[PDB]
Structure 1
């Protein structure tokens, strides 16, 4: 916790900027969900 200071912080939690920015990885590409055309069935 940066203890070389003579007046250190309580816990590391006050030494961070919890940033709520949500990032995600590149993510699989979806190819065949929609290549195909759709038959609007209206019955079973």
Structure 2
């Protein structure tokens, strides 16, 4: 509500409250496989070796 109680007479409509422009989140996950093993760079579609 915002119409209750009138202090003392004059009151305003809904949506008169300032808020905070930013975005946040409580958690993410755990992540580890993307920074463990080495990368092997390869130009071609496939590679062979003996």
Normalised TM-score (structure 1) = 0.59
Unaligned segments of structure 2, at least 5 residues: 46-50
Corresponding position: 1:6 with 2:7: yes
Alpha-carbon separation, structure 1, partners of 2:41 and 2:10: 63
Q: Which of the pair has more CA radius of gyration? A: 2
How many residues are matched? 44
Alpha-carbon separation, structure 2, partners of 1:8 and 1:15: 17
Q: Cα deviations across residues 16-42 of structure 1 (Å, max 9, x unaligned)?
A: 223112111221021111211101111
**Structure 1 residues 39 and 24, CA gap change in structure 2 (3 angstroms):** same
Unaligned segments of structure 1, at least 5 residues: none
